Task: structure prediction
Amino acid sequence: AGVSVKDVDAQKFITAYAAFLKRSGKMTTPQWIDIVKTGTHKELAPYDPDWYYVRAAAIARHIYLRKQVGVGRLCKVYGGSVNRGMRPSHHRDGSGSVQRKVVQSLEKIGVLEKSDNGGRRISQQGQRDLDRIAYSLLEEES
Amino acid sequence: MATSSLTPGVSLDENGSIKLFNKFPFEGVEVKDISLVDYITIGNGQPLPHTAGRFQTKRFRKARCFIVERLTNSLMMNGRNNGKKLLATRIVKHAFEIIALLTDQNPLQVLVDAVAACGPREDSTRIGSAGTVRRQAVDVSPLRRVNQALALITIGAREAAFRNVKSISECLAEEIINAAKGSSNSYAIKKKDELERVAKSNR
Amino acid sequence: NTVELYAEKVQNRGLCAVAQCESLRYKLLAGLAVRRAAYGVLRYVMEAGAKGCEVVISGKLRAARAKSMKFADGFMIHSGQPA
Amino acid sequence: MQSVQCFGKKGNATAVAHCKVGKGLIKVNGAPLSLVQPEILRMKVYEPILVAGADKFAGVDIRVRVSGGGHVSQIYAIRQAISKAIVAYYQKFVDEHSKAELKKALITYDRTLLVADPRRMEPKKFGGHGARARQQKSYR
Amino acid sequence: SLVVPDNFQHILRLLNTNVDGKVKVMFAMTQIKGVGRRYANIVCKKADIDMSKRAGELTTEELERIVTIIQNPSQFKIPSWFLNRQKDINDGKSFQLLANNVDSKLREDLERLKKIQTHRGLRHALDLRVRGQHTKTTGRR
Amino acid sequence: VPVKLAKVIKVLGRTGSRGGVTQVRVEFMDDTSRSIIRNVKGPVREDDILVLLESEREARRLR
Amino acid sequence: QHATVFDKSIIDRINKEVPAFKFISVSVLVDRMKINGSLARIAIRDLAERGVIQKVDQHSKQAIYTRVP
Amino acid sequence: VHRIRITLTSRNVRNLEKVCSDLVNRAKDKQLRVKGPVRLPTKILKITTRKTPNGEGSKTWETYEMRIHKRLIDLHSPSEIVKQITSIHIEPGVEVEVTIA
RNA sequence: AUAGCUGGAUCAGCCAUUUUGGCUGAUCAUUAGCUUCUUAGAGGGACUAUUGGCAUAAAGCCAAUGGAAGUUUGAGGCAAUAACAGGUCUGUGAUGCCCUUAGAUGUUCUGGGCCGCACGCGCGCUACACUGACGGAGCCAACGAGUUAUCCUUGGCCGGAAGGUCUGGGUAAUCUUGUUAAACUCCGUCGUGCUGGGGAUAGAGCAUUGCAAUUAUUGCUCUUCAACGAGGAAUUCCUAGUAAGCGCAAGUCAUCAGCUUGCGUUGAAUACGUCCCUGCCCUUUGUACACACCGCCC
Ligand SMILES: [Zn+2]
Result:
């Protein structure tokens, strides 16, 4: 009727849907999901233990909203100010080693597909999954 | 009515021919002041104070400006916090909420009374020319009352919230509440009392 | 034979400052009086149709103490696009 | 076919409103007015709707295509587009009297709802890091 | 959120550090010189222990487990690249500096570089900056 | 009793060393007479109400 | 010194005197009690999950909570 | 059915407009349906340099700019017409490109 | 059709549906028609017009409607006569004079130094946190730049994104690029203690740039984590999209910004004055000064 992922919060979807992704058994979190900082501009380590799940299922929303993205583009997106000590800060790219694995896990799930003349796109399966969950959160109230 | 978009039934008019604050601090009523009805501008509502109007290209466009807007402007100080109006209005919105919870009055009339009472009345200005250090007592214009009061509250809140668990919004709310009913305990009122006393002594 | 040259004779010669500067330089190299040479060129350009001319000779004219002599005469613009 | 296009801007930003026949549909870039990025500035973009009234704002479909500037510029541009879409729609397909009825209120209370702000960034001069402020000198 | 009336032993000690009484796990054993912020989390996950609870409630069995993983991380499927020291001079293996061994090896290596008379060693002897840091206007008093 | 409300009727000019204060003439509300010359630091315009606690001073000028 | 762990005294003190003051937040909890502040955040959450306290403008940093009447 | 594209890159607006007028005149002399000359954005080369040849004096800078304007066209000229038009429309200060791709 | 808008062939799926579809869209020289958002040549558009005010009622200003503008509409470029013993002989195959030349101050090569510190002075960056710091998420611009031997780089492959291998685009409003940037926003954690604030200093090793990196190139995985617990006499810049904070591009480039030249986002406090300090312009006035008060003289 009037429902789309264009007006829905998808961050809260991941926390509830982590169980469903485990039921599907296609996330395949790598062994280094506890040591890596997900970017050099980061300082200590990720805090939330579901960081890989949240990043994956939110990059899916990012790819939905976008036309087509690549690994390097996603690294630039997931950056920030880097504390360079006494020198003034600047912008540094993210961690390609975790961006590529996150996208590849999404492709194995099925929400993503490789687009022609582009890095990656979002499948109809991912489009329908995102729309259905967006409808659930938009319609559950009252 | 209802359309395809949800449009939640919370942001209705709920005004009575006004615009109101962000659906809680309220506006309209009478407000009013004793001697700043010409220098304090409380007319139509301002749902959020983050307005980008031009109020400095002329001399008295600052006078024809909202008191809360000038409070945000005088709060966006301490240059490490310069140019953050979103942070300033978030602090002000928080300060309005705690004021409304702490005191029965809505957080507009109390602020008007606070700045009205906080503004200095007699000031010992320097004569000048150096060496003489004589100084003389003079009066204060209503525009100077607004800016002096707003500055006094902002520095008072900032200094008293610089290092303590109490947040800036709570400190500003407490300062405004104390400065409203002449408590002689707030930093702004204490400074204005000292300024009036020294002006009287130097007179 | 990919490049060829055509030698045009002249399109006026009393208003092009480079030609007059060369003539003044050659006269100074010959050894005529600086004022007389600066005059001669200024009369030449004025007859050629100049509205206002300025000749400035700077350096060691007669002694070690170098100086600059200016013989500006006429209408001169020190401004933007007009200048 | 009731279709009309409008434009609005706040300097470096711009916004296009594709007003069309319908009801509601005040979405911006595919998302409604309730989900602008700055949560603390949503009432500013909702201001043109409530200045006139939801009763007189019905009967239009406004789609915005903002681009450029910052977040404050984006919300200013979309509110400008949503404020001029209704005026042009009610000028082209409704009586000019009602258009003026909307306009008088929309000008009586507005933060330059249809007047572009002419303020611009001053160019920077050599000798300092800002347009007007120059670096300090030792003097000794 | 958890059971409040439990047994506690306040102050606890492990590996040359008098850890405070009631602090969270990471803030508790970060006092020991040699462990890291990412090192704290990875050993906490590898030792099969919680993170929200305070370190005081830790029992002897978990203390023994944390000692074993701290002393021998290599034997528990951890590549040597994590450790700061690898392929040492005398033995030829990798280990971690957590106890007084860090100061002992630092002094021994300092004596070794004094013996071999390197430029970095001479700078260390003169108490100057070993790397290319300007000493023209800094390093005062 | 000590609270006096005065209304400015005209402005005279800048006085003092730096011009930081201005000499003005004020008139009370309940009393039409008694035009009082005063010195005010900040900018002052018409239709303003001045709150005063000491009025029997009759300041002439600021040096 | 601010308390680090609840000792069966602070819990009953807050559960009894939480409606004493009109404004409830981390700062006022550290003021009235001797709470560190992390426990103040957890106490605000543990009192807001029930009907003991009422949310007003809780978001970002400041936790704005008030007495039921 | 051949297609052409003249770069028409030049540094002077007056000379570019004159040669463009000549080109469109030759175009409408044969009625090849053409395309309107698309004015590509004027690419500007801007540099800054210090006035003084040494380090003494107040820090003053000079900014120099050079403007380049570019156009384009589309034709359907055969071999005889294209060789005639190329021999005719040659003008100073303008670079012309020929392609048939 | 070196950019978008729409239909057209063109396929993916439901909440409703076989008039009940919206919406998201994939491809696109398979095709057509338009330049309103992009492009710039010509253009219209400000004269403080107008009623009201003041000034010997002529030369302007104040507030206001209309407008994009009224401070010269903002900001720059060019900028008079005369002068400096102002800087540059090390920008110049620009230069007079002097010096030097085979055992060379000419040229070339190696290494070192220019960075060397008991100290003093300036231009600057980072902080001295709760408005904080850190972690999961969403994402908002402008000025520019890039290869014929050899730059800007897209897509694919394993892992300590430091990086590497293969394949393709761009000599360019098409590729980079839609510079999806930072600051920013939601939630959570650390809870005021020189603390997970501040990362100076040092220990070990991992790649890239380069004859090659030692006196650590640069960045990187780790550990220690100090002075700073918000600065005296003094002094600097600044009047509106200005100050200030934040980031980006370019110059110098084999590599290296804490610098400069420009741009953009957020965005103010105070004045609408004065000669009080510090200088400048004009007139009168005094002078025993005239390289002229940093004078002259006793
Ligand atoms: Zn040179």
User: Anything to note?
Assistant: Chain E is about 35% helix and 5% strand. The CA atoms of residues 8 and 57 of chain E lie 6 Å apart. Strands of chain E lie at 12-13, 18-19.
